[PDB]
Protein backbone atom coordinates (compact mmCIF):
# COMPACT_ATOMS: atom_id res chain seq x y z
CA UNK A 1 0.00 0.00 0.00
CA UNK A 2 1.76 3.11 1.31
CA UNK A 3 5.13 3.18 3.08
CA UNK A 4 6.69 6.27 4.63
CA UNK A 5 9.94 7.73 3.29
CA UNK A 6 12.18 10.43 4.75
CA UNK A 7 14.69 10.88 1.88
CA UNK A 8 17.74 12.25 3.75
CA UNK A 9 19.26 15.61 2.72
CA UNK A 10 22.31 13.71 1.48
CA UNK A 11 19.89 12.20 -1.03
CA UNK A 12 21.60 8.80 -0.88
CA UNK A 13 20.01 6.79 1.96
CA UNK A 14 16.23 6.80 2.42
CA UNK A 15 14.49 5.15 5.37
CA UNK A 16 11.31 3.18 4.66
CA UNK A 17 8.86 2.51 7.48
CA UNK A 18 5.63 0.52 7.46
CA UNK A 19 3.54 2.23 10.14
CA UNK A 20 4.27 5.55 11.82
CA UNK A 21 2.57 4.33 15.01
CA UNK A 22 3.09 1.05 16.85
CA UNK A 23 0.46 -0.65 19.00
CA UNK A 24 1.72 -1.95 22.35
CA UNK A 25 -0.65 -4.40 24.05
CA UNK A 26 -0.65 -5.49 27.70
CA UNK A 27 2.20 -7.97 27.24
CA UNK A 28 3.43 -7.86 23.62
CA UNK A 29 4.30 -4.78 21.55
CA UNK A 30 4.21 -4.75 17.75
CA UNK A 31 7.81 -4.85 16.46
CA UNK A 32 9.10 -2.18 14.09
CA UNK A 33 10.41 -3.07 10.65
CA UNK A 34 11.61 -1.39 7.48
CA UNK A 35 14.39 -1.07 4.94
CA UNK A 36 16.93 1.54 3.91
CA UNK A 37 18.10 2.03 0.32
CA UNK A 38 21.51 3.69 0.02
CA UNK A 39 23.47 4.39 -3.17
CA UNK A 40 26.25 1.77 -2.88
CA UNK A 41 28.62 3.85 -5.05
CA UNK A 42 29.47 6.17 -2.16
CA UNK A 43 29.54 3.55 0.61
CA UNK A 44 32.97 2.17 -0.22
CA UNK A 45 33.93 1.51 3.41
CA UNK A 46 31.52 3.53 5.55
CA UNK A 47 28.83 1.44 7.24
CA UNK A 48 25.20 2.56 7.50
CA UNK A 49 23.59 2.26 10.94
CA UNK A 50 19.99 2.79 12.04
CA UNK A 51 18.81 3.24 15.61
CA UNK A 52 15.81 3.91 17.82
CA UNK A 53 16.15 6.13 20.89
CA UNK A 54 13.60 6.54 23.68
CA UNK A 55 14.48 10.13 24.50
CA UNK A 56 13.43 12.06 27.60
CA UNK A 57 13.43 15.87 27.46
CA UNK A 58 12.96 17.71 30.76
CA UNK A 59 14.87 21.00 30.56
CA UNK A 60 12.17 22.99 28.74
CA UNK A 61 13.11 24.35 25.29
CA UNK A 62 16.14 26.35 26.41
CA UNK A 63 19.22 26.95 24.28
CA UNK A 64 21.77 24.16 23.99
CA UNK A 65 24.77 24.10 26.32
CA UNK A 66 28.42 23.13 25.87
CA UNK A 67 27.86 19.59 27.12
CA UNK A 68 24.66 19.53 29.17
CA UNK A 69 22.12 18.98 26.34
CA UNK A 70 19.36 18.55 29.00
CA UNK A 71 18.33 15.14 27.64
CA UNK A 72 18.15 11.52 28.78
CA UNK A 73 17.88 8.19 26.95
CA UNK A 74 15.85 5.29 28.34
CA UNK A 75 16.37 2.62 25.67
CA UNK A 76 18.68 2.86 22.65
CA UNK A 77 19.08 0.01 20.16
CA UNK A 78 21.32 0.22 17.09
CA UNK A 79 21.87 -2.30 14.30
CA UNK A 80 24.06 -2.55 11.21
CA UNK A 81 22.37 -2.27 7.82
CA UNK A 82 25.29 -1.95 5.38
CA UNK A 83 26.25 -4.82 5.36
CA UNK A 84 22.93 -6.42 6.43
CA UNK A 85 24.35 -8.12 9.56
CA UNK A 86 25.59 -11.50 8.26
CA UNK A 87 26.32 -12.59 11.84
CA UNK A 88 22.74 -12.25 13.15
CA UNK A 89 19.81 -13.63 11.18
CA UNK A 90 16.95 -11.21 10.53
CA UNK A 91 13.45 -12.77 10.62
CA UNK A 92 12.04 -10.35 8.05
CA UNK A 93 8.26 -10.07 7.85
CA UNK A 94 6.01 -10.05 4.79
CA UNK A 95 6.11 -6.25 4.65
CA UNK A 96 9.92 -6.30 4.55
CA UNK A 97 9.86 -8.99 1.84
CA UNK A 98 7.50 -6.97 -0.35
CA UNK A 99 9.48 -3.81 0.38
CA UNK A 100 12.85 -5.12 -0.79
CA UNK A 101 11.11 -6.92 -3.65
CA UNK A 102 9.85 -3.50 -4.78
CA UNK A 103 13.34 -2.01 -4.45
CA UNK A 104 16.63 -3.36 -5.75
CA UNK A 105 19.10 -5.77 -4.20
CA UNK A 106 21.12 -2.87 -2.74
CA UNK A 107 18.30 -1.97 -0.34
CA UNK A 108 19.04 -3.21 3.17
CA UNK A 109 16.51 -4.02 5.92
CA UNK A 110 16.42 -3.36 9.66
CA UNK A 111 14.39 -4.39 12.68
CA UNK A 112 14.21 -3.68 16.41
CA UNK A 113 12.33 -5.25 19.32
CA UNK A 114 10.69 -3.02 21.93
CA UNK A 115 10.68 -4.62 25.39
CA UNK A 116 7.27 -4.62 27.12
CA UNK A 117 7.59 -2.44 30.23
CA UNK A 118 8.35 0.91 28.60
CA UNK A 119 6.34 4.15 28.73
CA UNK A 120 4.04 5.04 25.87
CA UNK A 121 4.95 8.03 23.71
CA UNK A 122 3.66 10.98 25.75
CA UNK A 123 4.95 14.55 25.44
CA UNK A 124 4.47 17.20 28.11
CA UNK A 125 2.69 20.38 27.07
CA UNK A 126 5.31 22.97 26.01
CA UNK A 127 3.24 25.91 27.22
CA UNK A 128 3.26 29.47 25.87
CA UNK A 129 6.78 30.64 26.70
CA UNK A 130 8.70 27.54 25.59
CA UNK A 131 9.86 27.65 21.96
CA UNK A 132 11.59 24.57 20.59
CA UNK A 133 11.57 20.86 21.38
CA UNK A 134 8.85 19.64 23.73
CA UNK A 135 9.35 17.72 26.96
CA UNK A 136 8.29 14.18 27.79
CA UNK A 137 9.28 10.74 26.56
CA UNK A 138 9.53 10.41 22.79
CA UNK A 139 10.54 7.73 20.27
CA UNK A 140 12.83 8.58 17.37
CA UNK A 141 14.35 6.47 14.60
CA UNK A 142 17.41 7.85 12.81
CA UNK A 143 19.63 6.41 10.09
CA UNK A 144 23.22 7.47 9.46
CA UNK A 145 26.31 6.07 7.75
CA UNK A 146 29.50 5.91 9.82
CA UNK A 147 32.33 3.37 9.88
CA UNK A 148 32.78 4.02 13.62
CA UNK A 149 30.07 3.67 16.26
CA UNK A 150 31.41 6.72 18.14
CA UNK A 151 31.98 8.82 15.01
CA UNK A 152 30.15 12.12 14.60
CA UNK A 153 26.72 11.85 12.97
CA UNK A 154 26.75 14.77 10.55
CA UNK A 155 23.19 16.00 10.01
CA UNK A 156 24.14 16.99 6.46
CA UNK A 157 24.64 13.27 5.70
CA UNK A 158 22.11 11.64 8.03
CA UNK A 159 18.36 11.37 8.63
CA UNK A 160 15.82 11.05 11.43
CA UNK A 161 12.20 9.97 11.70
CA UNK A 162 9.67 10.24 14.52
CA UNK A 163 7.85 7.21 15.95
CA UNK A 164 5.09 7.04 18.54
CA UNK A 165 4.15 3.96 20.55
CA UNK A 166 0.51 3.84 21.62
CA UNK A 167 -1.63 1.54 23.75
CA UNK A 168 -5.18 0.45 22.94
CA UNK A 169 -7.81 -0.28 25.56
CA UNK A 170 -8.74 -3.88 26.41
CA UNK A 171 -11.77 -5.43 24.75
CA UNK A 172 -13.02 -6.86 28.06
CA UNK A 173 -13.68 -4.05 30.57
CA UNK A 174 -12.57 -4.48 34.15
CA UNK A 175 -14.65 -4.45 37.33
CA UNK A 176 -16.99 -1.59 38.08
CA UNK A 177 -14.94 1.00 40.04
CA UNK A 178 -16.68 1.53 43.38
CA UNK A 179 -15.25 2.96 46.60
CA UNK A 180 -17.12 4.18 49.69
CA UNK A 181 -15.24 5.59 52.67
CA UNK A 182 -16.51 7.03 55.94
CA UNK A 183 -15.28 9.32 58.71
CA UNK A 184 -16.70 11.28 61.64
CA UNK A 185 -15.70 14.20 63.84
CA UNK A 186 -14.98 14.34 67.57
CA UNK A 187 -18.49 15.69 68.25
CA UNK A 188 -20.20 12.32 67.74
CA UNK A 189 -19.44 8.79 66.53
CA UNK A 190 -21.86 8.88 63.58
CA UNK A 191 -19.72 8.70 60.43
CA UNK A 192 -21.21 9.42 57.01
CA UNK A 193 -20.84 7.18 53.95
CA UNK A 194 -19.87 8.41 50.47
CA UNK A 195 -21.14 5.75 48.07
CA UNK A 196 -19.14 6.51 44.92
CA UNK A 197 -19.10 4.39 41.77
CA UNK A 198 -18.64 4.62 38.01
CA UNK A 199 -20.30 3.17 34.91
CA UNK A 200 -17.42 1.15 33.42
CA UNK A 201 -13.66 0.78 33.85
CA UNK A 202 -12.51 1.71 30.32
CA UNK A 203 -13.60 5.03 28.80
CA UNK A 204 -12.87 6.52 25.40
CA UNK A 205 -11.27 9.85 24.58
CA UNK A 206 -14.21 12.24 24.75
CA UNK A 207 -16.61 9.67 26.19
CA UNK A 208 -18.64 11.26 29.01
CA UNK A 209 -17.45 10.16 32.44
CA UNK A 210 -20.56 9.39 34.49
CA UNK A 211 -19.74 9.45 38.20
CA UNK A 212 -22.40 7.85 40.40
CA UNK A 213 -22.49 9.30 43.91
CA UNK A 214 -24.71 8.74 46.94
CA UNK A 215 -24.48 10.59 50.26
CA UNK A 216 -25.78 9.54 53.68
CA UNK A 217 -25.58 12.61 55.95
CA UNK A 218 -26.37 10.86 59.21
CA UNK A 219 -23.97 13.22 61.01
CA UNK A 220 -25.58 16.35 62.45
CA UNK A 221 -23.83 18.58 59.90
CA UNK A 222 -24.33 20.11 56.47
CA UNK A 223 -22.50 19.71 53.16
CA UNK A 224 -21.85 23.06 51.49
CA UNK A 225 -20.35 21.73 48.25
CA UNK A 226 -19.36 18.46 46.59
CA UNK A 227 -16.01 18.47 44.78
CA UNK A 228 -16.13 16.24 41.70
CA UNK A 229 -12.87 16.21 39.77
CA UNK A 230 -11.31 13.87 37.23
CA UNK A 231 -7.56 14.27 37.67
CA UNK A 232 -4.51 12.98 35.82
CA UNK A 233 -1.76 11.50 37.99
CA UNK A 234 1.45 11.56 35.93
CA UNK A 235 4.07 9.56 37.84
CA UNK A 236 7.19 11.11 36.30
CA UNK A 237 9.74 8.46 37.29
CA UNK A 238 13.27 9.16 36.03
CA UNK A 239 15.36 9.79 39.17
CA UNK A 240 12.46 10.15 41.64
CA UNK A 241 8.71 9.60 41.95
CA UNK A 242 7.32 13.10 41.39
CA UNK A 243 3.66 12.14 41.02
CA UNK A 244 1.80 15.15 39.66
CA UNK A 245 -1.83 15.88 40.54
CA UNK A 246 -2.99 18.09 37.68
CA UNK A 247 -6.83 18.13 37.49
CA UNK A 248 -7.87 17.69 33.86
CA UNK A 249 -11.52 18.51 34.54
CA UNK A 250 -13.50 19.38 37.64
CA UNK A 251 -16.97 20.50 38.69
CA UNK A 252 -18.75 21.74 41.80
CA UNK A 253 -22.07 20.45 43.12
CA UNK A 254 -24.05 22.83 45.34
CA UNK A 255 -26.46 20.10 46.47
CA UNK A 256 -26.66 20.62 50.22
CA UNK A 257 -27.90 17.67 52.27
CA UNK A 258 -29.59 17.99 55.66
CA UNK A 259 -28.49 15.90 58.65
CA UNK A 260 -30.09 12.44 58.82
CA UNK A 261 -30.78 12.58 55.09
CA UNK A 262 -29.66 10.76 51.95
CA UNK A 263 -29.23 12.04 48.40
CA UNK A 264 -27.91 10.56 45.15
CA UNK A 265 -27.65 11.61 41.51
CA UNK A 266 -25.22 10.84 38.70
CA UNK A 267 -22.91 13.63 37.53
CA UNK A 268 -21.32 13.77 34.09
CA UNK A 269 -17.73 14.76 33.29
CA UNK A 270 -15.77 15.05 30.05
CA UNK A 271 -11.96 15.32 29.94
CA UNK A 272 -10.84 17.48 27.02
CA UNK A 273 -8.03 19.81 25.97
CA UNK A 274 -9.85 22.88 24.60
CA UNK A 275 -9.78 24.80 27.89
CA UNK A 276 -6.64 23.13 29.30
CA UNK A 277 -4.18 24.54 26.75
CA UNK A 278 -2.52 27.08 29.05
CA UNK A 279 -2.10 24.59 31.92
CA UNK A 280 1.57 23.64 31.75
CA UNK A 281 2.65 20.20 32.86
CA UNK A 282 -0.29 18.46 31.18
CA UNK A 283 0.62 15.19 29.48
CA UNK A 284 -0.24 14.95 25.77
CA UNK A 285 -0.31 11.56 24.04
CA UNK A 286 2.27 11.69 21.28
CA UNK A 287 3.61 14.39 18.98
CA UNK A 288 5.17 14.00 15.55
CA UNK A 289 6.69 17.47 15.25
CA UNK A 290 4.14 19.93 16.71
CA UNK A 291 0.69 18.63 15.69
CA UNK A 292 -1.98 18.86 18.36
CA UNK A 293 -3.06 15.65 20.09
CA UNK A 294 -5.27 14.57 22.99
CA UNK A 295 -4.56 14.16 26.67
CA UNK A 296 -2.32 11.24 27.55
CA UNK A 297 -4.18 7.95 27.30
CA UNK A 298 -3.80 6.01 30.54
CA UNK A 299 -0.94 3.53 30.37
CA UNK A 300 -1.80 -0.12 30.94
CA UNK A 301 0.47 -1.86 33.44
CA UNK A 302 0.71 -5.57 34.24
CA UNK A 303 1.01 -6.59 37.88
CA UNK A 304 3.88 -8.84 38.90
CA UNK A 305 6.53 -6.72 37.16
CA UNK A 306 8.54 -3.80 38.50
CA UNK A 307 6.63 -0.51 38.31
CA UNK A 308 9.70 1.61 39.16
CA UNK A 309 11.62 1.15 35.89
CA UNK A 310 9.36 3.26 33.65
CA UNK A 311 9.87 6.82 32.46
CA UNK A 312 6.44 8.49 32.53
CA UNK A 313 3.24 6.76 33.67
CA UNK A 314 -0.13 8.49 33.25
CA UNK A 315 -3.04 7.14 35.28
CA UNK A 316 -6.49 8.64 35.76
CA UNK A 317 -8.47 8.42 39.00
CA UNK A 318 -11.62 10.51 39.40
CA UNK A 319 -11.68 11.95 42.92
CA UNK A 320 -14.92 12.76 44.74
CA UNK A 321 -14.83 15.17 47.68
CA UNK A 322 -17.45 16.78 49.90
CA UNK A 323 -16.81 19.85 52.06
CA UNK A 324 -18.62 20.43 55.36
CA UNK A 325 -18.73 23.15 58.02
CA UNK A 326 -17.52 23.11 61.63
CA UNK A 327 -20.00 25.67 62.94
CA UNK A 328 -21.34 25.55 66.46
CA UNK A 329 -20.28 26.79 69.89
CA UNK A 330 -16.82 27.79 68.60
CA UNK A 331 -16.35 27.53 64.84
CA UNK A 332 -16.71 29.19 61.47
CA UNK A 333 -17.36 28.26 57.85
CA UNK A 334 -13.83 26.88 57.49
CA UNK A 335 -13.62 23.13 58.14
CA UNK A 336 -12.12 19.90 56.77
CA UNK A 337 -13.14 17.37 54.13
CA UNK A 338 -12.72 13.67 53.34
CA UNK A 339 -11.76 12.25 49.94
CA UNK A 340 -12.36 8.83 48.39
CA UNK A 341 -10.81 7.99 45.03
CA UNK A 342 -12.09 6.07 42.00
CA UNK A 343 -9.63 4.70 39.44
CA UNK A 344 -10.62 4.45 35.79
CA UNK A 345 -8.93 3.87 32.44
CA UNK A 346 -9.20 6.42 29.62
CA UNK A 347 -7.69 5.18 26.34
CA UNK A 348 -8.46 4.88 22.65
CA UNK A 349 -10.31 1.93 21.09
CA UNK A 350 -8.52 -0.79 19.09
CA UNK A 351 -9.42 -0.41 15.38
Amino acid at each position, epitope marked *: *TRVFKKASPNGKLTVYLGKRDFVDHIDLVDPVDGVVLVDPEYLKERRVYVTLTVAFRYGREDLDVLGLTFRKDLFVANVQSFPPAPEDKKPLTRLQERLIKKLGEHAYPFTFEIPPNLPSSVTLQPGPEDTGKALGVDYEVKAFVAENLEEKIHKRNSVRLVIRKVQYAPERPGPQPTAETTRQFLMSDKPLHLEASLDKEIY*Y*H*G*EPISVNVHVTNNTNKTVKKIKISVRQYADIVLFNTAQYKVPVAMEEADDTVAPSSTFSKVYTLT*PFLANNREKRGLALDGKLKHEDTNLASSTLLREGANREILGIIVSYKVKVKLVVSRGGLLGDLASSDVAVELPFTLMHPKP
Partner: single-chain antibody, 225 residues
Framework: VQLVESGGGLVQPGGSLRLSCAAS????????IHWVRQAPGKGLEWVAS????????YYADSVKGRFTISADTSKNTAYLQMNSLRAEDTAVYYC?????????????WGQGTLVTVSSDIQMTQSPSSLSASVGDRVTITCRAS??????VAWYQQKPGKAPKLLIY???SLYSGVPSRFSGSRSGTDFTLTISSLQPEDFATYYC?????????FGQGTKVEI
Protein backbone atom coordinates in the same frame (compact mmCIF):
# COMPACT_ATOMS: atom_id res chain seq x y z
CA VAL B 1 -27.50 7.85 16.33
CA GLN B 2 -28.55 10.34 13.64
CA LEU B 3 -27.98 14.09 13.45
CA VAL B 4 -30.47 16.92 12.88
CA GLU B 5 -29.95 20.11 10.90
CA SER B 6 -32.14 23.21 10.75
CA GLY B 7 -32.06 27.00 10.61
CA GLY B 8 -31.90 27.30 6.83
CA GLY B 9 -34.42 29.21 4.77
CA LEU B 10 -35.03 32.20 2.54
CA VAL B 11 -32.70 35.06 3.51
CA GLN B 12 -32.32 38.35 1.65
CA PRO B 13 -28.86 39.39 0.42
CA GLY B 14 -26.58 40.74 3.13
CA GLY B 15 -28.67 39.10 5.86
CA SER B 16 -27.86 36.73 8.70
CA LEU B 17 -28.94 33.18 9.46
CA ARG B 18 -28.35 31.02 12.55
CA LEU B 19 -28.45 27.48 11.18
CA SER B 20 -28.87 24.97 14.01
CA CYS B 21 -27.32 21.50 13.75
CA ALA B 22 -27.45 18.95 16.57
CA ALA B 23 -26.36 15.33 16.96
CA SER B 24 -28.23 12.83 19.13
CA UNK B 25 -26.22 10.17 20.93
CA UNK B 26 -22.82 11.66 20.00
CA UNK B 27 -20.43 13.13 22.54
CA UNK B 28 -19.21 16.45 21.19
CA UNK B 29 -15.70 15.88 22.55
CA UNK B 30 -15.35 12.82 20.31
CA UNK B 31 -17.10 14.06 17.14
CA UNK B 32 -16.31 17.09 15.00
CA ILE B 33 -18.98 19.03 13.10
CA HIS B 34 -18.38 19.99 9.47
CA TRP B 35 -20.32 22.12 6.99
CA VAL B 36 -20.30 21.68 3.21
CA ARG B 37 -22.08 23.90 0.68
CA GLN B 38 -23.62 22.85 -2.63
CA ALA B 39 -24.81 25.18 -5.39
CA PRO B 40 -27.65 24.33 -7.81
CA GLY B 41 -26.42 21.49 -10.00
CA LYS B 42 -22.73 21.89 -9.16
CA GLY B 43 -20.07 20.37 -6.93
CA LEU B 44 -19.81 20.32 -3.16
CA GLU B 45 -17.89 23.05 -1.34
CA TRP B 46 -16.57 22.94 2.22
CA VAL B 47 -17.15 26.22 4.05
CA ALA B 48 -16.06 25.65 7.67
CA SER B 49 -15.61 23.03 10.37
CA UNK B 50 -15.29 23.01 14.16
CA UNK B 51 -13.60 20.46 16.42
CA UNK B 52 -14.59 20.97 20.05
CA UNK B 53 -11.70 18.93 21.45
CA UNK B 54 -8.94 21.35 20.46
CA UNK B 55 -11.09 24.48 20.24
CA UNK B 56 -9.87 25.05 16.69
CA UNK B 57 -11.82 26.96 14.02
CA TYR B 58 -10.89 26.12 10.43
CA TYR B 59 -12.20 28.39 7.68
CA ALA B 60 -12.53 28.07 3.93
CA ASP B 61 -10.66 30.44 1.63
CA SER B 62 -13.82 32.03 0.23
CA VAL B 63 -15.61 32.72 3.54
CA LYS B 64 -12.53 33.09 5.77
CA GLY B 65 -13.74 35.00 8.82
CA ARG B 66 -17.03 36.11 7.24
CA PHE B 67 -19.10 33.25 8.72
CA THR B 68 -19.77 33.40 12.45
CA ILE B 69 -19.60 30.33 14.69
CA SER B 70 -21.34 29.43 17.95
CA ALA B 71 -21.43 25.95 19.48
CA ASP B 72 -22.04 24.35 22.87
CA THR B 73 -21.38 20.88 24.26
CA SER B 74 -24.02 20.70 27.00
CA LYS B 75 -26.85 20.53 24.44
CA ASN B 76 -24.70 18.71 21.83
CA THR B 77 -25.56 21.48 19.36
CA ALA B 78 -23.48 23.56 16.95
CA TYR B 79 -25.13 26.67 15.52
CA LEU B 80 -24.13 28.18 12.17
CA GLN B 81 -24.59 31.95 12.41
CA MET B 82 -24.36 33.68 9.03
CA ASN B 83 -23.15 37.23 8.45
CA SER B 84 -23.35 39.32 5.25
CA LEU B 85 -24.35 36.60 2.80
CA ARG B 86 -23.08 37.21 -0.73
CA ALA B 87 -24.45 36.08 -4.10
CA GLU B 88 -22.49 32.81 -3.83
CA ASP B 89 -24.26 31.86 -0.58
CA THR B 90 -27.40 30.71 -2.46
CA ALA B 91 -26.56 27.08 -1.80
CA VAL B 92 -27.87 24.18 0.26
CA TYR B 93 -25.62 23.64 3.29
CA TYR B 94 -25.02 20.22 4.86
CA CYS B 95 -23.89 19.83 8.44
CA UNK B 96 -21.84 16.66 8.78
CA UNK B 97 -19.96 14.60 11.34
CA UNK B 98 -16.54 12.99 11.09
CA UNK B 99 -14.69 11.14 13.83
CA UNK B 100 -12.96 13.89 15.81
CA UNK B 101 -10.15 11.42 16.51
CA UNK B 102 -8.32 9.82 13.57
CA UNK B 103 -10.40 11.45 10.83
CA UNK B 104 -12.07 8.93 8.52
CA UNK B 105 -14.36 11.03 6.35
CA UNK B 106 -17.64 12.81 7.08
CA UNK B 107 -19.57 9.76 8.26
CA UNK B 108 -22.98 10.97 9.46
CA TRP B 109 -24.61 13.72 7.39
CA GLY B 110 -27.61 15.91 8.03
CA GLN B 111 -30.58 16.35 5.73
CA GLY B 112 -29.14 19.60 4.35
CA THR B 113 -30.53 23.11 4.82
CA LEU B 114 -31.45 24.79 1.54
CA VAL B 115 -31.06 28.58 1.52
CA THR B 116 -31.41 31.19 -1.21
CA VAL B 117 -30.31 34.82 -1.43
CA SER B 118 -31.51 37.53 -3.82
CA SER B 119 -1.67 25.87 -2.24
CA ASP B 120 -5.34 25.00 -2.74
CA ILE B 121 -5.48 21.36 -3.82
CA GLN B 122 -7.91 21.04 -6.75
CA MET B 123 -8.85 17.40 -7.27
CA THR B 124 -10.42 16.62 -10.65
CA GLN B 125 -12.79 13.78 -11.53
CA SER B 126 -12.96 11.73 -14.72
CA PRO B 127 -15.33 10.87 -16.32
CA SER B 128 -17.66 13.77 -15.46
CA SER B 129 -20.66 11.57 -16.33
CA LEU B 130 -21.47 7.96 -17.14
CA SER B 131 -24.36 5.77 -18.26
CA ALA B 132 -24.52 2.02 -17.69
CA SER B 133 -26.95 -0.83 -17.09
CA VAL B 134 -27.08 -3.51 -14.39
CA GLY B 135 -23.87 -5.52 -14.13
CA ASP B 136 -21.72 -3.28 -16.33
CA ARG B 137 -18.22 -2.67 -15.01
CA VAL B 138 -17.77 1.01 -14.13
CA THR B 139 -14.60 2.71 -12.89
CA ILE B 140 -14.51 6.37 -11.84
CA THR B 141 -11.18 8.17 -11.44
CA CYS B 142 -10.37 11.27 -9.39
CA ARG B 143 -7.09 13.04 -10.14
CA ALA B 144 -5.46 15.21 -7.48
CA SER B 145 -3.19 18.08 -8.50
CA UNK B 146 -0.79 17.39 -5.62
CA UNK B 147 -0.16 13.89 -4.30
CA UNK B 148 -1.68 12.82 -0.98
CA UNK B 149 -1.34 9.82 1.34
CA UNK B 150 -4.55 7.98 0.37
CA UNK B 151 -6.57 10.38 2.52
CA VAL B 152 -9.66 10.31 0.30
CA ALA B 153 -13.11 8.90 1.06
CA TRP B 154 -15.66 8.07 -1.64
CA TYR B 155 -19.34 9.02 -1.41
CA GLN B 156 -22.57 7.99 -3.15
CA GLN B 157 -25.14 10.78 -3.50
CA LYS B 158 -28.52 10.02 -5.06
CA PRO B 159 -30.94 12.76 -6.18
CA GLY B 160 -31.90 14.85 -3.17
CA LYS B 161 -30.94 12.58 -0.30
CA ALA B 162 -28.02 13.12 2.07
CA PRO B 163 -24.72 11.87 0.59
CA LYS B 164 -23.12 9.01 2.49
CA LEU B 165 -19.64 7.52 2.38
CA LEU B 166 -18.91 3.91 1.47
CA ILE B 167 -15.11 3.58 1.64
CA TYR B 168 -12.77 5.74 3.72
CA UNK B 169 -9.05 6.38 3.15
CA UNK B 170 -9.65 4.96 -0.37
CA UNK B 171 -8.85 1.48 0.99
CA SER B 172 -11.19 0.32 3.77
CA LEU B 173 -14.94 0.12 3.15
CA TYR B 174 -17.35 1.32 5.82
CA SER B 175 -19.71 -1.02 7.62
CA GLY B 176 -23.24 -1.29 6.28
CA VAL B 177 -22.09 -1.04 2.65
CA PRO B 178 -22.09 -4.16 0.43
CA SER B 179 -18.70 -5.69 -0.33
CA ARG B 180 -19.18 -5.11 -4.08
CA PHE B 181 -17.82 -1.58 -3.53
CA SER B 182 -14.07 -0.95 -3.43
CA GLY B 183 -11.41 1.64 -4.20
CA SER B 184 -7.80 1.99 -5.28
CA ARG B 185 -4.81 4.32 -5.02
CA SER B 186 -2.52 5.11 -7.98
CA GLY B 187 -0.14 7.96 -7.21
CA THR B 188 -2.03 11.24 -7.24
CA ASP B 189 -4.91 9.73 -9.27
CA PHE B 190 -7.65 8.02 -7.27
CA THR B 191 -10.07 5.42 -8.61
CA LEU B 192 -12.87 3.26 -7.26
CA THR B 193 -14.58 0.31 -8.94
CA ILE B 194 -18.06 -1.20 -8.85
CA SER B 195 -18.90 -4.73 -9.97
CA SER B 196 -22.68 -4.71 -10.52
CA LEU B 197 -24.57 -1.45 -11.05
CA GLN B 198 -27.70 -2.16 -9.03
CA PRO B 199 -30.69 0.20 -9.23
CA GLU B 200 -29.80 1.60 -5.80
CA ASP B 201 -26.15 1.96 -6.87
CA PHE B 202 -27.18 4.14 -9.84
CA ALA B 203 -26.32 7.42 -8.13
CA THR B 204 -23.92 10.33 -8.40
CA TYR B 205 -20.52 9.69 -6.81
CA TYR B 206 -18.31 12.35 -5.20
CA CYS B 207 -14.67 12.23 -4.12
CA UNK B 208 -12.93 14.51 -1.64
CA UNK B 209 -9.53 14.86 0.01
CA UNK B 210 -8.92 15.61 3.67
CA UNK B 211 -5.13 15.37 4.08
CA UNK B 212 -4.58 19.13 3.77
CA UNK B 213 -6.87 21.76 5.27
CA UNK B 214 -9.02 23.10 3.63
CA UNK B 215 -10.71 19.95 2.33
CA UNK B 216 -11.97 20.05 -1.25
CA PHE B 217 -14.43 17.87 -3.15
CA GLY B 218 -14.02 16.56 -6.69
CA GLN B 219 -15.89 17.59 -9.82
CA GLY B 220 -18.99 15.40 -9.44
CA THR B 221 -19.75 12.38 -11.63
CA LYS B 222 -23.34 11.57 -12.59
CA VAL B 223 -24.31 7.95 -13.24
CA GLU B 224 -27.13 7.40 -15.74
CA ILE B 225 -28.77 4.40 -17.42
Amino acid sequence: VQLVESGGGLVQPGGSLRLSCAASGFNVYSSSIHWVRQAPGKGLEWVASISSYYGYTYYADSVKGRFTISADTSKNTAYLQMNSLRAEDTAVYYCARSRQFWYSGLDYWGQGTLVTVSSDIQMTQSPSSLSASVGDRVTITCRASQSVSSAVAWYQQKPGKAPKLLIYSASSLYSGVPSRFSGSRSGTDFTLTISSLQPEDFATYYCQQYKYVPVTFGQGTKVEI
